Amino acid sequence: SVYITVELAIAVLAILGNVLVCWAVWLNSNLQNVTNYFVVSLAAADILVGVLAIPFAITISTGFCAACHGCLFIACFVLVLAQSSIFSLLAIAIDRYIAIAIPLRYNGLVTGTRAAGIIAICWVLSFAIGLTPMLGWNNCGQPGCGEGQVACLFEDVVPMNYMVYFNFFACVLVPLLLMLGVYLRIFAAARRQLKQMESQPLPGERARSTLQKEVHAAKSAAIIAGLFALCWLPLHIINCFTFFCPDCSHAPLWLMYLAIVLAHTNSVVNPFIYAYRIREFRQTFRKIIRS
Ligand SMILES: Nc1nc(NCCc2ccc(O)cc2)nc2nc(-c3ccco3)nn12
């Protein structure tokens, strides 16, 4: 019960923090742009974490008895929310890129409609991937609870060749490498703009000020995606240790818990990172609380 509380504590903060981020975008129309449409997808996702993921994660911890479908769901649901966030964070990455790179075509391309469409597909593909073990790629009955029900234990029910080759390497590592690659060009061309506006026979502080803020938002976005990888890589690397190195000390349960917990923490930093990196956001939250 010493660690049980921690998981619940995180669940609460995850719900409040993001429901606040969602309500703030519903009151302040100065946040209701195409960009923040994806932010909500990330928020709503990190909300279902403290609402479902954590409640599930803490359940399958001690293990239980239920069918394969029911078990795999309570075991692969967290893979969905995390996978959805992969799409969102990648979207935001491309978003800030289109804005800084092609400011004019930004409005003609990055529309509020296409935003909704993408988000929808992101979740659809999020379930297709996150629940792949349910498609048949699972270990239900691969050497108590009686016929029908299965001893719902993560390691015994969820494949490793999947969460490594498929999940991590492809559906997480590759995206992060793409996201990284994006922010590479973003901050690369951004400073080129400042260089071109340095040899100009005119002030034009409108371009500079606006750009520096488009960059400020891009940087703030980079800090968001950065925390994700920083709060998931540990758990994934562990899976690579247990998998690729069978003789290597199988990660301890206590260290395994800590690592798994860290992932549940990524659903809490976003609210605080907005109220910190975004002056527009913090002022909105302040209004809500006071009033
Ligand atoms: N190797 C491994 N073992 C387990 N075992 C379940 C142990 C456990 C489960 C829940 C909890 O709160 C504390 C401990 N869960 C695991 N979850 C993950 C994981 C999730 C996302 C990426 O890796 N890997 N993994």
Swiss-Prot record:
Any one Gene Ontology MF annotation carried by this entry is: identical protein binding
Q: Which residues of the full protein are shown?
A: 7 to 305 of 412
Transmembrane stretches, by residue range? Answer: 2-26, 37-60, 72-94, 115-137, 160-184, 221-244, 253-276
Annotated adenosine binding sites: 155, 239, 263-264
Keywords attached to this entry = Cell membrane, Disulfide bond, G-protein coupled receptor, Glycoprotein, Membrane, Receptor, Transducer, Transmembrane, Transmembrane helix, Ubl conjugation
Record's GO cellular component terms: asymmetric synapse; axolemma; dendrite; glutamatergic synapse; intermediate filament; membrane; neuronal cell body; plasma membrane
Classify the protein's membrane topology as the record does: Multi-pass membrane protein
**One Gene Ontology term from the biological process aspect of the record:** positive regulation of synaptic transmission, glutamatergic
Q: What does the UniProt PTM comment say about this protein? A: Ubiquitinated. Deubiquitinated by USP4; leading to stabilization and expression at the cell surface.
Tell me how this protein assembles.
Answer: Interacts (via cytoplasmic C-terminal domain) with USP4; the interaction is direct. May interact with DRD4. Interacts with NECAB2. Interacts (via cytoplasmic C-terminal domain) with GAS2L2; interaction enhances receptor-mediated adenylyl cyclase activity.
Q: Where in the cell is it found?
A: Cell membrane
- Report the sequence similarity comment from the record: Belongs to the G-protein coupled receptor 1 family.
Q: Which organism is it from?
A: Homo sapiens
Any ranges marked Extracellular in the topology annotation, and which? 61-71, 138-159, 245-252
Q: What is this protein called?
A: Adenosine receptor A2a
Which residues are on the Cytoplasmic side of the membrane? 27-36, 95-114, 185-220
